[PDB]
Amino acid sequence: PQITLWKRPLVTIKIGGQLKEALLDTGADDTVLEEMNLPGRWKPKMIGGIGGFIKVRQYDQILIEICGHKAIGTVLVGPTPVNIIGRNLLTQIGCTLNF
Amino acid sequence: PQITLWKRPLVTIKIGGQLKEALLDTGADDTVLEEMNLPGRWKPKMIGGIGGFIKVRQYDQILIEICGHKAIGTVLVGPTPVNIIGRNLLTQIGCTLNF
Numbered sequence: 001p002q003i004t005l006w007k008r009p010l011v012t013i014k015i016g017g018q019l020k021e022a023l024l025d026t027g028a029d030d031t032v033l034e035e036m037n038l039p040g041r042w043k044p045k046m047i048g049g050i051g052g053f054i055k056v057r058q059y060d061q062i063l064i065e066i067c068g069h070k071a072i073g074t075v076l077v078g079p080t081p082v083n084i085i086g087r088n089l090l091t092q093i094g095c096t097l098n099f
Numbered sequence: 100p101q102i103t104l105w106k107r108p109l110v111t112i113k114i115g116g117q118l119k120e121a122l123l124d125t126g127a128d129d130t131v132l133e134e135m136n137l138p139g140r141w142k143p144k145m146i147g148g149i150g151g152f153i154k155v156r157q158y159d160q161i162l163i164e165i166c167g168h169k170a171i172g173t174v175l176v177g178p179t180p181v182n183i184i185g186r187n188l189l190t191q192i193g194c195t196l197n198f
């Protein structure tokens with residue numbers, strides 16, 4: 001689909017059997033989601049936004065279904081104010097900016 | 100143009116007679132730039148994201164040329180680690196997500 005940016009580009013995602021809404025964020029290198037439980041072993045990391053940094057838990061090779069499109073990749077879990085789909089997963093569903 | 104997201108969507112902008120590179124950020128509601136001089140009056144504001152908040156100076160009706168696309172709108176000036184073109188200006192140049 002083609003999403004215009006008059007409203008936030010919010011889409012529905014399915015991850016770990018749960019439904020959520022996430023923000024298609026071209027400004028985010030990595031996908032970051034609010035607190036939740038996920039499989040596999042995770043390792044610490046720190047990511048920086050506009051107001052500093054937060055501590056997240058990095059999960060690799062995690063399946064996400066973004067508005068119907070499936071993708072497997074890194075997912076960061078931490079105290080983000082918004083669920084964010086970063087470029088690490090946007091490239092997999094073949095998303096592009098166009099103007 | 101069509102911009103893929105394998106690399107950060109950095110583009111060339113032209114504001115206040117200066118040349119810079121900015122991040123086409125669909126996750127950003129409004130445009131935020133690093134410190135610089137701009138014309139006219141401004142008002143204090145605070146914007147929040149991953150990590151917390153920063154104090155910015157809001158300039159209204161500021162001319163920017165994004166990849167050769169002219170736009171006039173709100174421009175926030177503050178300690179952002181990256182120059183961010185937010186949705187407030189992406190809409191004016193006809194930017195859309197497509198997958």
Ligand SMILES: CC(C)CN(C[C@@H](O)[C@H](Cc1ccccc1)NC(=O)O[C@H]1CO[C@H]2OCC[C@H]21)S(=O)(=O)c1ccc(N)cc1
Pocket residue numbers: 023025026027028029030031032047048049050051082084086122124125126127128129130131146147148149180181183185
């Ligand atoms: C976090 C979003 C809900 C909103 N943000 C835009 C977002 O693209 C930021 C904007 C951004 C871009 C680069 C550097 C700092 C902030 N990027 C970001 O947080 O990504 C982080 C998670 O993955 C990593 O990728 C880069 C930073 C990490 S924001 O910076 O806080 C913001 C909020 C409001 C306005 N008007 C302008 C910008």
